[PDB]
Amino acid sequence: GKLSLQDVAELIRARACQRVVVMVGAGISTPSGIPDFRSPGSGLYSNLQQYDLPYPEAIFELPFFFHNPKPFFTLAKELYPGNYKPNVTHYFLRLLHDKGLLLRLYTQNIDGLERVSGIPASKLVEAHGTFASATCTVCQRPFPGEDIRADVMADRVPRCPVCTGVVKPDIVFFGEPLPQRFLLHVVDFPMADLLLILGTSLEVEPFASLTEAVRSSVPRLLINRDLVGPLAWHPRSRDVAQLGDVVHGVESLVELLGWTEEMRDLVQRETGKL
Amino acid sequence: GKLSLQDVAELIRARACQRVVVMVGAGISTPSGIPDFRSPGSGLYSNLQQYDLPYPEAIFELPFFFHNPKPFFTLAKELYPGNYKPNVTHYFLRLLHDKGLLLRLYTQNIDGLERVSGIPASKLVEAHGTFASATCTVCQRPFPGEDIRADVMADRVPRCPVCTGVVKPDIVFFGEPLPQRFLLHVVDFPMADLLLILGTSLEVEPFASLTEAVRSSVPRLLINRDLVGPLAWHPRSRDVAQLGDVVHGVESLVELLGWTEEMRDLVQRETGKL
Amino acid sequence: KLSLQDVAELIRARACQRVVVMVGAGISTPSGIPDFRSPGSGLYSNLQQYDLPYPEAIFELPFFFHNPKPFFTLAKELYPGNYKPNVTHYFLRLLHDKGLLLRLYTQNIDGLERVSGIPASKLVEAHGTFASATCTVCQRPFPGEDIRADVMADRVPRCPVCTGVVKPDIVFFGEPLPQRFLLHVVDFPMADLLLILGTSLEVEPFASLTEAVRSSVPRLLINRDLVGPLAWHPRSRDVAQLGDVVHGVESLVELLGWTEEMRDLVQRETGKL
Amino acid sequence: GKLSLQDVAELIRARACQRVVVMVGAGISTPSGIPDFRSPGSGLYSNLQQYDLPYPEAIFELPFFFHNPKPFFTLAKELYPGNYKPNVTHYFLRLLHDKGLLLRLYTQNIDGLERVSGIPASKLVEAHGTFASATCTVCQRPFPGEDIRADVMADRVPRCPVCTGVVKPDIVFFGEPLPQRFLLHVVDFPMADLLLILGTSLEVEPFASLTEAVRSSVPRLLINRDLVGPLAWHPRSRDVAQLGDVVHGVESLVELLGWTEEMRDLVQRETGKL
Amino acid sequence: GKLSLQDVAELIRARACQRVVVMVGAGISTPSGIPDFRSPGSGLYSNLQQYDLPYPEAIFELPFFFHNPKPFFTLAKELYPGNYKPNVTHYFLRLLHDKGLLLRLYTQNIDGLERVSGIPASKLVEAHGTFASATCTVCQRPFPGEDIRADVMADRVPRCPVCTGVVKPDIVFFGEPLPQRFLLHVVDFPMADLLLILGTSLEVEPFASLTEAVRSSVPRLLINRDLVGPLAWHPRSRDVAQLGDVVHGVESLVELLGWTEEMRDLVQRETGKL
Amino acid sequence: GKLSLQDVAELIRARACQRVVVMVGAGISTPSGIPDFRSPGSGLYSNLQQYDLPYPEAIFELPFFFHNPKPFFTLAKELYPGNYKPNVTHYFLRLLHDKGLLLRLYTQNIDGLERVSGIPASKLVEAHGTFASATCTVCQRPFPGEDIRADVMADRVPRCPVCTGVVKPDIVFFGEPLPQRFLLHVVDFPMADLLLILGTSLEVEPFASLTEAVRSSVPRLLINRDLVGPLAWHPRSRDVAQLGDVVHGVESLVELLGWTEEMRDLVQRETGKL
Amino acid sequence: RSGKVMR
Amino acid sequence: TRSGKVMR
Amino acid sequence: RSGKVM
Amino acid sequence: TRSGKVMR
Ligand SMILES: *C(=O)[C@@H](N)CC(C)C
Ligand SMILES: *C(=O)[C@@H](N)CC(C)C
Ligand SMILES: *C(=O)[C@@H](N)CC(C)C
Ligand SMILES: *C(=O)[C@@H](N)CC(C)C
Numbered sequence A, B, D, E, F: 001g002k003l004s005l006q007d008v009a010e011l012i013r014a015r016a017c018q019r020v021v022v023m024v025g026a027g028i029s030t031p032s033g034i035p036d037f038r039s040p041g042s043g044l045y046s047n048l049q050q051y052d053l054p055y056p057e058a059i060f061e062l063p064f065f066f067h068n069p070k071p072f073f074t075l076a077k078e079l080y081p082g083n084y085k086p087n088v089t090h091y092f093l094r095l096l097h098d099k100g101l102l103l104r105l106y107t108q109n110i111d112g113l114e115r116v117s118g119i120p121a122s123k124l125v126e127a128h129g130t131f132a133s134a135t136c137t138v139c140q141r142p143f144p145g146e147d148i149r150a151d152v153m154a155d156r157v158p159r160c161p162v163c164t165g166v167v168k169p170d171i172v173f174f175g176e177p178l179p180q181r182f183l184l185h186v187v188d189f190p191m192a193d194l195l196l197i198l199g200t201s202l203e204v205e206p207f208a209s210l211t212e213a214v215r216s217s218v219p220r221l222l223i224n225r226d227l228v229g230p231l232a233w234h235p236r237s238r239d240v241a242q243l244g245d246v247v248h249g250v251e252s253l254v255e256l257l258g259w260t261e262e263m264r265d266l267v268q269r270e271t272g273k274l
Numbered sequence C: 001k002l003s004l005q006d007v008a009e010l011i012r013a014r015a016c017q018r019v020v021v022m023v024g025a026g027i028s029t030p031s032g033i034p035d036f037r038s039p040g041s042g043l044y045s046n047l048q049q050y051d052l053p054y055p056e057a058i059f060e061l062p063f064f065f066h067n068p069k070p071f072f073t074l075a076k077e078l079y080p081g082n083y084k085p086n087v088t089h090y091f092l093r094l095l096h097d098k099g100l101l102l103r104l105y106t107q108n109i110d111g112l113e114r115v116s117g118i119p120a121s122k123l124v125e126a127h128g129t130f131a132s133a134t135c136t137v138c139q140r141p142f143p144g145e146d147i148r149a150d151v152m153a154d155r156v157p158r159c160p161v162c163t164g165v166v167k168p169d170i171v172f173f174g175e176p177l178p179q180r181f182l183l184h185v186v187d188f189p190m191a192d193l194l195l196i197l198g199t200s201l202e203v204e205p206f207a208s209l210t211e212a213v214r215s216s217v218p219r220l221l222i223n224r225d226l227v228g229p230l231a232w233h234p235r236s237r238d239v240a241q242l243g244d245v246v247h248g249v250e251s252l253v254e255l256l257g258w259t260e261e262m263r264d265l266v267q268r269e270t271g272k273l
Numbered sequence G: 001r002s003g004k005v006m007r
Numbered sequence H, J: 001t002r003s004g005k006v007m008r
Numbered sequence I: 001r002s003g004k005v006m
């Protein structure tokens, strides 16, 4: 009574699963070349060592930001929309949306590549925020990301046109509440008929517990390097694990679905658009 | 030198007391047949046992609500406007309002029977919230109760027309701040010339302390089963206690006021509209 | 479903010989123990004599260190000697004598379990006791007896060494439960019968202990009401003897066939008091 | 070597310092006759003793305000705009602004004398709030200060025209967040080429750390009664302390700047307008 | 009416007051030459700036101590028994004890001069701890101060003979509970028939509230530079204030008592032993 | 100049380094076959899935322990002394001790292999506790680990001979304070002339900050799979990194030290005793 | 001694 | 140790 | 300002 | 989320 990747594929092709909820992490973005600011070896890391940071995570701490906002904006400059492109996984999720199968996509990433691949914001829950928009720290005025792009690309600290306060990208900092849209989980997970987990161990709350928020009959497909976290600890009969490289597994599923041509077409058009 | 129920009645008839502040609790609504969700023996209690609740009070906890909002909406369905009617006490307060004697009515109840009896919202402080209005958990948009009424009556979880998040009735949950209008006490209690306490022990703060916020010259009339709480612990010279059945005490007071006919007619008309 | 007689017969057959008991205020009101929160008793008035914001403040340390006299008013009223055990206590005692009592968890501070002849080792006094005291300054322990005179003479007991206030080992608000409470970890899995007497079970962590016994273990409730975890999560082998506690206990005693042994015991023990 | 007051004066005259950030406290306003409510001997103190205050600071505590708002409004009545005038220090800061040298002025005072002296609001950070505006405690409606002035001067507790709740001046109470504009420090202190500290030790955070937020090369001039606080514990080479009477020190600096006549003229015009 | 210092003197002379409770602060030790470690001008200060202290109080913080115990032990070396002698205030308190009038002496100082003046430990409540004894930070073994004295005077960090952990003097650090003996106040202040306050404003709790713990009929004599704290805010009819020099005021009280020669005799004898 | 592994070896051979402080983590014990209770695939993991645990870490939580102590004692039975043997790393540390070079060994492990390899308890700091000793949960009586061994191996919950309470191994649970001996770091790290880090990323405080407690002139040698943590973020000139297999790196160091044969003898003798 | 907080 | 973004 | 706790 | 143990 065990399920295969092909079983899930056929479930999707037959539209027995048409309300798919997806949870993704850093694993899906490393094929795009997104540098880990915590890991040594990248130019970002080196550039970050120049400052008086006690540890890397201090970049997402408000006290340090208000002490010195330049490291964070080093990171922002590195990850701002345009510098990096979506890869095959992002476009698979996009195709999932286009065929009317994507209920919601919950992401922990801040590279904003889900948005860049053409998935509408309403299908997204950017749980750690985004660089696509910013808010002034003083007068709370909202700004599109573009409005400060120049300043960010010129290593200048963006100042509000009204009160001259620092304009900060809408990245969620430590201590800050998760975005309001996160609460969509309340309705999304009971409604899901398929749970897709990509490039994340989901060992950190509140995401870990969300894996058990789907109904018991609902298949949970993990495409990850390892089988760890709540899916390893609390397995269900209809769990499917495609262990190994994320890109490889996603491509496998895409083939089993018979979407390869549609996929290459999509990627051609979209890379063409950029 | 003690005051009697009749002394208070005469104070009202001479309108020496024309700024009456009222505090009410669960006691005044049990004659209407409102079920205690905490007590076994009711259909509500039974229905609530169907879920993975550790205890009844968990329906007023936000983590459980976001885990599963269905138990709370079982409660909301039971207590929603229409299912129950006000009794003699509510209409006594209504009559009190009509004769221009009611300064404010502070209620701990969430059955909304004060509103149904025809007391205007401006005269009410619903300290534990209300089903008359709702707020979306995601985008914070306010809605009239009717907007979700249908959903609530069909055991469907109400979702927002704009962002599709859960629309939650404005009931105050544990940990949450009391409603803003509660702060009206700051001006209402020093201004009161009579304090009426009906159907509540008042053992829980911040209500317990409000009984002492009125001036020393102000009579405090308790119509309750027992004499306990701050009025028992800190008695004042002008306190009056009408112990026993609440309905009986209120009817006694109405008779002493000579409002019995106006009352039977008011109940006649209002039950007539319902 | 099981009856009271079924449980009685289970005990008589010694199929249940590791009984764990939980008791509350209900078992002590027939002894005339006054509720300090309720108006109408002399205790309530005497406590009204002081600058208390509310009665419960007698169990708060900041107020105690502000003025320890209200608390010692309570202590004087409830100190060992002033009150006698009733039928429930002596039933629990008899349960101990027949080698059936594993442990008795009590929320009461009247100390009537001890007076009835149940050894300290069989007891878990979850809200503390007047049987022992501790100096608030130098932490020296004292038997309750050592301060009895002072307490009974309306004096605030002071330490013979440093003159700090010697405080009875009653648990105040905010304070940790006594160490012996952790015995529940071993006692409830070992129980073959759970007895709940005279308590609403509204207060944690005491309530949840009712669910710590194995699923096959009968839970017998002798209380006025069926409320708490017993009402919310009922089990197949639960028994509720609702109504007056004394009456229910007496019924069980008859069904056990212990009525005369009980009358004799009460005779001897009341005789010694 | 080590710097003198004249050295700082000359630095300003030489236009080596043209981005001055100023932090002021209660010390600069006592020459205006502003009474210390904490210290016995003032009429304000005497009037405040009328109430059941455990300590003076309780007038800036919300629980006490909602218990009895009258002490606070005694204070508010005393310090409301009009009753007091700016002194030489305030006008020195004004002159600093007029010559285009003032980057920002952070004030701990609530006397609002910085405004009266003619410094534009955009140049001010009133970190402990203001009497220039008020907010209703219930419905959060904003009001100009003028709107409640009459009530405040007539010892009446100002109530909202809409919901009748108490209207409270926008003074920051203990526990409340500092005003948003405080965050301007993030951009103001890295830009400063001179730090001026007047009539405050700046011994309590978050103000204490701000004294170190300026670059190491930036002179810090303290004009205060005593040398205590962060300047005492962590001195920098280019720190200057003008101990003694604040007014005297300011006048000395004004002479050393050669601004004495411009000052006498300015005070003439502005005192003339009042 | 109001009382004078002489009234107190005769109250003592008739021994109608024989249960005197005394509270003292830093002021009474400044005549002994005790350096204020936070204030510049002392050698202790200079020696302490050699370290990475963010603020003076960090010398009494456990995290910093376990990061670097050398600053604290610099302080300890400076204040260790022997380096300083008691003055007239201490010996006045001593005489108060010798005539059997002293119930208890509560001190905030850590110089331990109350003991050196010959006051028995049972009469003292050293609320911030003492250098007379130490405790090992690892195995909690107690040690007399002498045991580590050598180590302290040789700038060596004292290590335990058993487990080699740091042996720390019994000074109360920030966050740590006040000593057990503090709880003696519960019995001491209701029993007091005279309250003496020397060289402290008592602005910080719990001492502040302790000033009001004596009965209303009990006289409170303040000998301090200023009249501030709870004594200023909540004055009582039998309060007496000797403002000015602490030493001079004490000398005045001693003369008025007619103990002056007995005092100089005492000082002669006591200085003789050191 | 940068240092090599061979440089460190030569430093040790010359006893220029004879006060070595060592910090180890999970990495050094995986060659011994120690199962990760968090990772699926071991018999321990399987046995732990038997219980109603929400996540693995709950075996180290007191509320769960007091709810059901059996999972923890499953773990204890698995990791109790005897079931596993020390490897080359442990025995290298042992040889380090025998040659009089080991100042202290700080471990995060609870496998107790440091003790089994023959390192005396006084040289150890077991920061997450140990199975070598146990404490009764009720009366706090201490017991040697062996004393409860039988009960632990017979799947019985060990009970105290005095009060019959559960006797719990001295493993530090989440929320509990670190062992007292941890504070030895205060004296150990300033005294170290060599810091050795084996098999740990040192990502968790308070261990992270300890890497910086050694003097700047003191070499820090990392033998680990990766170069991450404070050693990566804040590198020092005399840091050395032996990246790769821990066993391999240790063997390399042993060869460079010329202790290879002594090491072989030691491991043979000690494996011989087991 | 109370303060006012930074958000 | 690690830091969280808080669920409201 | 820090406080030793009562 | 993860849990720690406290330095006292
Ligand atoms: C919070 O943890 C975010 N901002 C960090 C990214 C690495 C996801
Ligand atoms: C806050 O601490 C303010 N409101 C106090 C004034 C004296 C500035
Ligand atoms: C605690 O606050 C002590 N260490 C301070 C003294 C200087 C009184
Ligand atoms: C704390 O984290 C300890 N108890 C866990 C070990 C398995 C390292």
Ligand SMILES: [Zn+2]
Pocket: A136, A137, A138, A139, A140, A141, A160, A161, A162, A163, A164, A165
């Ligand atoms: Zn702005």
Ligand SMILES: [Zn+2]
Pocket: B136, B137, B138, B139, B140, B141, B160, B161, B162, B163, B164, B165
């Ligand atoms: Zn919405």
Ligand SMILES: [Zn+2]
Pocket: C135, C136, C137, C138, C139, C140, C159, C160, C161, C162, C163, C164
């Ligand atoms: Zn004692």
Ligand SMILES: [Zn+2]
Pocket: D136, D137, D138, D139, D140, D141, D160, D161, D162, D163, D164, D165
């Ligand atoms: Zn309003």
Ligand SMILES: [Zn+2]
Pocket: E136, E137, E138, E139, E140, E141, E160, E161, E162, E163, E164, E165
């Ligand atoms: Zn030691």
Ligand SMILES: [Zn+2]
Pocket: F136, F137, F138, F139, F140, F141, F160, F161, F162, F163, F164, F165
């Ligand atoms: Zn034990």
